[PDB]
Assembly symmetry: C2
Homo-oligomer: 463 residues x 2
């Protein structure tokens, strides 16, 4: 049911067009692009406080790519290779970046010299490529991740790296809270961690179909990469030690989830700061004081633009009904309607998208009325969102009880686990599910092997 | 001399790092990225008035790519090819986009149906790839054009297309005028036009080394592409005619030229709206009322931020001299200095980057003082720039006189030309130069063959 809804809204709302001749590569249409744009504005406000945006190349030579032990093994046959430059075959294969460690790190080796240089915090929003699963899904599992934001940091001590991991987590929390997206934070199992990292922390959110979606990862790379690419720095004493690195990223999934989670029957419902328009003015006219209604709307639009609003005056010549439907299925938060009546009273009708509540406000101080409504809409959407997710995280004491809950109610399943490979693998195989990760807490007994369970773990059917 | 200057400033000002293992692919460092960012902000303000930003894929399948007669011939061996997806060879070669006609047009065939749909105006800023000349030059001739802005339009009548070409030209004029970049507009010879177009209009600017740089092109594609990809539309009568298309683009060259043209001995000099910082506050202190000087600067910074300025308070602990040098070689327009004296008077020293003129202003209304200075700096830079270019465009009546001027003074050479292939080719071969394009005007006699010359043409040594 959700799948169909999603695919249809992506088309109706004109977000992406999937009819491109190459599987897993979609087109961002005007409207979709605007949402993506606003989502990135929000992200960058946060990231630009302490990160420096850069932009590295797309192509990586075998030499550099296969320079890592496990990392290269991790993306072995998941990499696209350019072999020819025109008719002639390149004397050195070039891979489209799957992620940029092998692109930036050799360069980091040069930029880093003294401890005065550290810490360094960079990020870029580029397009990456991954040749994976025959199962292609819009914004969720694409071959061309068109909105891959990857941040990479460099530190003097391992201590600072761990500290950075904590900061990244807080940055994502804030990012997501701004999109009203709920999340579960866990430490992925050591066999699912980013190829070559010390450990991976992941953010997972729940899709309306009971399936889970990884919407963010933070990795503590320790110094394994530093040693590989020779990223050393001079200490205040005169010694030469390797650096401690971390990296974290998000993809188009963040947009998929903002669409999916605040999804609706009427179409899209979006956080005010993400919608293409925050306020759409719709004039109601039947050839009766029209000239005065129109000039009341125009006055209003200009007044809102100057106030900092992303407003749109829909003066098209169609029935107000159709207009309502359109801007509603497109996710516009507030609709301001103006008719002869209310006009001859100095007021207008303001309709919310999340609730449907129409109120009456004085065009005189409407700016503040709108700002407040917007703050309200996000809080509501974020709240609802959190309730819906938590109400889907259920505890299980028996491995059999887990199977019953997953298969019947879907959602996330909480449980105490010993934290052993074989036991975890067995759990996954038996329940045909995936262990998202752990969260350290009081002990107990592993739901599967009964041994001492140091971790609170979660599992679910994932994307 | 210029070459060395350019390369050194790109490094000193930390714009791009060329030390990447793959020739023709450079890295945008933090500072460079900020300039690129601001340059694009300026561009988008203009383009977003009547264009809709989109984002298409990077990869194009042979099927689509080689679907055009001349277009495919034009980028035959200039295209990079991905042949393998992991270890397995793709059953369909994929080319990195050189430009996106073959990527978007098949998709345009679907989006276009009724005349009510037209006109459509799109654009995107993506990275494109071109395997060309062994001669790689930073921001001027790269394999990965990291800042390729391509706009594509669709029209019902050929008349509107030509009209669009005129609009594009005006858009670029405004873009460039904002960067204070001077330009010569001409109609490229029919053998240099964009592969498959009806005709190409190009913008050329002059580099400090007397060489010319193409910084923008507009193409009228007529309906040749429409027929190729089947982009038809229903007329108000019920007929099905093809569409009229145009497309135009810019690359990183725009940034190269803003750096080069307003170049300087002290380093970078940039239009206020392009610099990473428009105002850098430098407090002068020698342990004498410091606490009061610092709090005067902080107060000022905040005050400027809230006014809309991109300001930076350099409170580092180094000699004010070094600070001056740094922000000067980096292109910061205005430097605001505050010391005990001026402070105890309610004034500060404002230094211009283009001139070096230091003035004294009341911290009380400094906001306006700064805004005015910024407007002034651009006008000055744009003016100077235009003078320098025009003073390098020289007329020639004899083909021999041309050779003397080019070889001795470089620059651009104006001349009357018959407009024939063979004559033009001959001119180029004999003068070892390139014919930029023509400009229709009163007749005369071709500088080479003496026949009737309908066109005013220009030539020069180019990049
Ligand atoms: N095929 C895909 N389609 C869409 N999003 C994806 C895809 N693969 C991964 N992602 C998203 O991108 C994020 C980062 O991917 S990753 O492999 O975990 N980590 C990185 O690549 C690290 N180098 C951090 S920059 C994931 O958390 C996930 O939300
Ligand atoms: N290798 C290159 N490096 C940097 N800039 C380039 C390169 N090749 C072309 N350009 C710049 O990019 C602009 C557009 O390139 S073009 O081939 O003339 N035209 C297009 O590709 C058309 N499809 C318009 S979008 C040129 O005007 C030129 O200024
Ligand atoms: Mg697993
Ligand atoms: Mg030529
Ligand atoms: Zn166990
Ligand atoms: Zn001639």
């Amino acid at each position: 049911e959700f799948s169909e809804w999603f695919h249809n809204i992506l088309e109706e709302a004109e977000i992406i067009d999937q009819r491109y001749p190459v599987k897993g590569m979609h087109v961002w249409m005007p409207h979709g692009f605007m949402i993506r744009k606003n989502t990135l504005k929000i992200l960058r406000r946060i990231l630009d406080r302490d990160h420096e945006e850069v932009l590295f190349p797309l192509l990586v030579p075998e030499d550099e790519l296969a320079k890592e032990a496990i990392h290269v093994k991790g993306f072995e046959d998941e990499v696209y290779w350019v072999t020819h430059g025109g008719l002639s075959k390149l004397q050195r294969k070039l891979a489209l970046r799957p992620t940029s460690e092998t692109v930036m790190y050799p360069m980091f080796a040069l930029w880093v010299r003294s401890h005065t240089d550290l810490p360094m915090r960079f990020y870029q929003v580029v397009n990456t490529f991954r040749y994976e699963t025959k199962h292609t899904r819009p914004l969720i599992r694409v071959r061309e991740i068109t909105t891959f934001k990857e941040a990479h940091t460099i530190h003097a001590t391992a201590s600072e790296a761990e500290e950075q991991v904590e900061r990244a987590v807080e940055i994502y929390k804030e990012f997501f809270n701004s999109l009203g997206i709920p999340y579960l934070i866990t430490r992925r199992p050591p066999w699912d961690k980013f190829p070559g990292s010390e450990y991976t922390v992941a953010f997972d959110t729940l899709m309306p179909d009971g399936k889970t979606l990884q919407i963010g990862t933070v990795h503590n790379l320790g110094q394994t990469f530093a040693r590989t690419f020779e990223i050393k720095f001079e200490t205040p004493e005169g010694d030469h030690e390797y650096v401690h690195q971390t990296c974290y990223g998000l993809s188009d999934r963040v947009i998929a989830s903002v669409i999916a989670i605040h999804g609706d029957e009427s179409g899209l419902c979006l956080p005010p700061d993400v919608a293409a328009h925050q306020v759409v003015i719709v004039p109601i006219i039947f050839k009766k004081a029209a000239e005065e209604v129109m000039e009341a709307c125009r006055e209003l639009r200009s007044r809102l633009e100057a106030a900092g609003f992303r407003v749109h005056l829909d003066d098209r010549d169609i029935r107000a009904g159709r207009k309502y439907y359109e801007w509603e299925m497109r996710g516009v938060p507030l609709r301001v309607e103006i008719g002869p009546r209310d006009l001859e009273k100095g007021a207008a009708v303001i309709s919310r998208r999340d609730t449907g509540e129409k109120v009456t406000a004085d065009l005189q101080g409407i700016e503040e009325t709108l700002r407040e409504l917007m703050k309200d809409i996000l809080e509501n959407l974020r709240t609802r969102a959190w309730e819906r997710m938590e109400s889907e995280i259920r505890e299980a004491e028996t491995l059999e009880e887990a199977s019953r809950i997953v298969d019947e109610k879907r959602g996330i399943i909480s449980f105490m686990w010993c934290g052993e490979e074989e036991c975890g693998m067995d759990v996954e195989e038996k329940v045909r599910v995936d262990i998202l990760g752990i969260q350290e807490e009081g002990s107990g007994t592993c739901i599967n092997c009964g041994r001492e369970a140091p971790y609170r773990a979660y599992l679910a059917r994932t994307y």
